[PDB]
């Protein structure tokens, strides 16, 4: 199992680097989670590493190369979830040298059984043999799909006598196996034999070894612990005569093509299924352990695969005004800052990045490959508290910081959780303050194989130049130099900034302890010297009253002109500065409890 590609006909580097990239990516890969794109490969390339591929999720693209054979003898299922040109799941084009010295002559796809979506495009291949002798409608599932297979070969030999005119090559081991066009009239799909009792299950992708949902080669929808099913077990059982729905004692959730006992902690649960985000008519609601979708808030969507944009840019960044939670990924690429003249998109004003200072959660990944040359940190994301990781870069990555050559610190001072994925922070020649940071307090679960932080500013020079974070910070470290960028303070914080102590026994703005932070005492509280000033910020939590006492509360003066359950209320001060109600016949106040004391 490995990730696929999406480069189309483009390539990176020279002929040897194009091959080494292809080799390393697919070296022991059985299932390609994307496209299989083999473009401009040389005539002497060893492609035997592809022999283990059984299944392709997207399309198979083979173009403008010079190798003689395509060694995919085990590829059975091509799902076509992504389609080349919008039509074709297999695209084979121009695979020959213009001087005819080298060309592709054989596609070794002898086990290819089914294409679940899309057609077949095999065109312009002067030396490619046996393509008009393949019963391609036995393989292509969709009856409305386009099949070309035209200008391929000239003097090519016929199929071997044992193949009955249907083959992938000249040999007796090259014959095509027909699994759909020779079936019993009743079966609507692939078979394992010609009898009406020898047909494959409706949920199978490609062939099968028997008629059961556990004899199946691959599933079309969900795999329920070995059994292919159209849906996972539902919470309610329906009675066709009484029209009742009874609870199902054995339910499961739908998650990415497999049935699971419970939904992953970083996903939101819909009706029996786990999704990255809720439907347009639902919002995410926090429950016990898991999140759920319920019957909305602004649809502040992100960038990357599944969205309309590949990066934040001068025509996209305005969509995040007043955004607190981004659905999906947030990508910053070089073209997103410098501009993209191909689409008439101007360069981004560096100070428009301040629109992200209100974002507290990103449900996907954060990917920064470009940042303005005068911005030495990512303080624009100082308000970010969670990276959800429900959609990851390539596979596994939930945070990327690559080659930002003017950045000295990470920032993200409010960040408490990265719920899933891997961290890649590398090649940033100025980046220094990350070396002391303890990632097991930020990244959830085991971290032994998830933290990739190579190169950057050497730690030796970072400490030697005096870049170790403020001494007030505890073991675990900081996001930068300041006392406000620490994960946790040694003693107390004051508004999120680390301090040596609180103003408990002394200090004009007297304070009290609460949740390891310093908080001020009530304005009417009497300051203490040598003992605690207060136990809270309320009018009844102080050690002594600064002015006048009114029952349990301290006040600056006794109240006058107050309207309560019985109308106007007036109180007078006593010799000890205590407030008491005035006589029943007083007007606007009094000097005592008696009738003669009224004003």
């Amino acid at each position: 199992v490995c990730p696929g590609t999406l480069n189309g006909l483009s390539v990176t580097g020279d002929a040897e680097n194009q091959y080494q990239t292809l080799y390393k990516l697919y070296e022991r890969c059985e299932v390609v989670m994307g496209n299989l794109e083999i473009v401009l490969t040389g005539h002497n390339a060893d492609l035997s590493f592809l022999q283990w591929i059984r299944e392709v999720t997207g399309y198979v693209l083979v173009a403008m190369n010079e190798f003689s054979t395509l060694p995919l003898p085990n590829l059975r299922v091509v799902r076509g979830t992504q389609v080349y040109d919008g039509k074709f799941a297999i695209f084979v084009m121009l695979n020959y040298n213009t001087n005819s010295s080298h060309a592709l002559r054989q596609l070794r796809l002898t086990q290819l059984t089914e294409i679940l979506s899309g057609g077949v495009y095999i065109e312009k291949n002067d030396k490619l043999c046996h393509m008009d002798t393949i019963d391609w409608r036995d393989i292509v599932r969709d009856r409305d799909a386009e099949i070309v297979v035209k200008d391929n070969g000239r003097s090519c030999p016929p199929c071997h006598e044992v193949c009955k005119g249907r083959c992938w090559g000249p040999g007796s081991e090259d014959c095509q196996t027909l699994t759909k066009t020779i079936c019993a009239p009743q079966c609507n799909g692939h078979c394992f034999g010609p009898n009406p009792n020898q047909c494959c299950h409706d949920e199978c992708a490609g062939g099968c070894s028997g008629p059961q949902d556990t004899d199946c080669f691959a599933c079309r929808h969900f795999n329920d612990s070995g059994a292919c099913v159209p849906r996972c077990p539902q919470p309610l059982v329906y009675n066709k005569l009484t029209f009742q729905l009874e609870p199902n004692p054995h339910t499961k959730y739908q998650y990415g093509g497999v049935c699971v006992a419970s939904c992953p902690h970083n996903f939101v649960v819909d009706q029996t299924s786990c999704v990255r985000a809720c439907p347009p008519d639902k919002m995410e609601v926090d429950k016990n352990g898991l999140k759920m979708c319920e019957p909305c808030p602004k649809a502040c969507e992100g960038t990357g695969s599944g969205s309309r944009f590949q990066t934040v840019d001068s025509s996209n960044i305005d969509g995040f005004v007043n955004c607190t939670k981004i659905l999906g990924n947030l990508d910053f690429l070089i073209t997103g800052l410098n501009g993209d003249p191909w689409h008439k998109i101007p360069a981004l004003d560096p100070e428009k990045l301040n629109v992200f200072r209100t974002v507290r959660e990103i449900t996907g990944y954060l990917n920064i490959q470009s940042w303005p040359p005068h911005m030495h940190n990512f303080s624009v994301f100082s308000n970010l508290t969670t990276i959800g990781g429900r959609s990851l870069y390539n596979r596994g990555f939930s945070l990327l910081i690559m080659k930002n050559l003017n950045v000295t610190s990470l920032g993200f001072r409010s960040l408490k959780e990265i719920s899933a994925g891997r961290i890649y922070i590398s090649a940033n020649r100025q980046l220094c303050y990350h070396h002391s940071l303890n990632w097991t307090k930020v990244l959830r679960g085991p971290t032994e194989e998830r933290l990739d932080i190579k190169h950057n500013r050497p730690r030796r020079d970072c400490v030697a130049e005096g870049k170790v974070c403020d001494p007030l910070c505890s073991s675990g470290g900081c996001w930068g130099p300041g006392p406000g960028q620490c994960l946790s303070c040694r003693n107390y914080s004051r508004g999120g900034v680390c301090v040596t102590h609180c103003n408990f026994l002394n200090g004009e703005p007297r304070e009290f302890a609460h949740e390891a932070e310093c908080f001020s005492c009530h304005p009417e509280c009497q300051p203490m010297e040598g003992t605690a000033t207060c136990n809270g910020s309320g009018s009844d939590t102080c050690a002594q009253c600064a002015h006048f006492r009114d029952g349990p509360h301290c006040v600056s003066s006794c109240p006058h002109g107050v309207l309560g359950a019985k109308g106007p209320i007036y109180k007078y001060p006593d010799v000890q500065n205590e407030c008491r109600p005035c006589h029943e016949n007083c007007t606007q106040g009094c000097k005592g409890p008696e009738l003669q004391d009224c004003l």
Binding site: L6, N7, G8, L9, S10, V11, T12, G13, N17, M64, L94, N97, T98, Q310, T311, L333, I334, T335, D340, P341, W342, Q369, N394, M402, K403, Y424
Partner: protein, 49 residues
């Protein structure tokens, strides 16, 4: 081969120093050959590791 260099306007298709090529074909098909450190259909992304 089967590829030719892109025209003065078309050379704008690819980014980050990549060289733009055309496939010789009724519809236009655009290629770019990226530097070793860049990938993606237009060379717009960095290569990891």
């Amino acid at each position: 081969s089967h590829l030719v260099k892109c025209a003065e306007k078309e050379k704008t298709f690819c980014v980050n120093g990549g060289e733009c090529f055309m496939v010789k074909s009724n519809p236009s098909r655009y290629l770019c050959k990226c530097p070793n450190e860049f990938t993606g259909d237009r060379c717009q992304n960095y290569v990891m590791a």
